[PDB]
Design a protein around this ligand. Structure first.
Ligand SMILES: CN1CCN(CCOc2cc(OC3CCOCC3)c3c(Nc4c(Cl)ccc5c4OCO5)ncnc3c2)CC1
Length: 293
């Protein structure tokens, strides 16, 4: 596709599949004739929230409004048109999701020097970070709300034919008094549009079993959330592979870690962890249960 096109082998510009009034960037503190990047000139860099092969996430203060944000910056200039398209897809997916109280809000995005910058609202800690700070299983009173909020997010995605494909503790973010937002939309696919195939794999700890056979559907996210909540509620490390990975995808809940679950929460997780995606409860069906209203 892009690989056989004459797009190979070739000044900040706004990135947006919903063109706003001009794609030239401006800000207090920014002069395009100075050599520093828009990101360097237009933000106070406060701390690094994360890093990896993808690049880095920074906590920043905007010079435009003085508010705090999270900016993700890719590691190196685009390898080529397919690499560029893959990274820009995160912006498109954020815009497909749009405004929802339980989804992370995208403020703006731009490219400069082959680097993609994604500016979102700054959220509270991820569930992974919150569990690390707690040092123990999270109380079920909290967990029920995290489950409900993230199911509301998934119901929103799934109603638009979108599959997140990488739901995990590290991209569900706390908020005000115990509300959660789902973020990290880099692997999200629009069913029927991706024609893929070329779909990347999420974290193997939370991967739905049917994805091994290439059966992609909204049900995959319900399974991933099931194991996300299992991990959070039981302080249980999940296997990347091996026999334990298989057991969790055969309807098995290890007694060593899960005996402390209430029957109510266990029963909901059993619905979400159904190995057969055709029998697995939907986000909307789970939200209709009295326990989750
Ligand atoms: C010292 N701690 C004080 C509390 N503070 C809480 C807020 O932490 C975050 C962390 C984020 O990302 C890390 C979480 C786990 O994955 C690695 C990074 C946030 C985040 N990440 C993010 C992701 Cl995962 C994907 C795309 C993005 C992102 O920002 C902009 O575009 N986004 C928003 N808020 C975050 C708050 C931690 C430090």
């Amino acid at each position: 596709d892009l690989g056989t096109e004459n797009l190979y082998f070739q000044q900040p510009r706004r990135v947006s599949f919903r063109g706003e009034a001009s794609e030239t960037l401006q800000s207090p503190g920014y002069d395009p004739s100075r050599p520093e990047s828009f990101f360097q000139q237009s933000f106070q860099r406060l701390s690094r929230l994360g890093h990896g092969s993808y690049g880095e996430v920074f906590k920043v203060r905007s010079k435009e409004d003085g508010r705090l944000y999270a900016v993700k910056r890719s590691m190196s200039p685009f390898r080529g048109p397919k690499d560029r398209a893959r990274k820009l897809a995160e912006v498109g997916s954020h815009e497909k999701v749009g405004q929802h109280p339980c989804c992370v809000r995208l403020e703006q995005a731009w490219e400069e020097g082959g680097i993609l910058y994604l500016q979102t609202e700054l959220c509270g800690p991820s569930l992974q970070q919150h569990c690390e700070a707690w040092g123990a299983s999270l109380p079920e009173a909290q967990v029920w709300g995290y489950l409900r909020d993230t199911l509301l997010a998934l119901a929103h995605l799934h109603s638009q034919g979108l599959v997140h494909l990488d739901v995990k503790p590290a991209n569900i973010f706390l908020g005000p008094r115990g509300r959660c937002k789902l973020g990290d939309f880099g692997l999200l696919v629009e069913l029927g549009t991706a024609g893929a195939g070329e779909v990347q794999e999420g974290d193997p700890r939370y991967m739905a079993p049917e994805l091994l056979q290439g059966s992609y559907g909204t049900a995959a996210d319900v399974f991933s959330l099931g194991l996300t909540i299992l991990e959070v509620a039981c302080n249980m490390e999940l296997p990347h592979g091996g026999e334990g990975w298989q057991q969790l995808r055969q309807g098995y809940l290890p007694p060593e870690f899960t005996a402390g679950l209430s029957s109510e929460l266990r029963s909901v997780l059993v619905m979400m962890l159904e190995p057969d995606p055709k029998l697995r409860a939907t986000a909307e069906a789970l939200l209709a249960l009295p326990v989750l209203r």
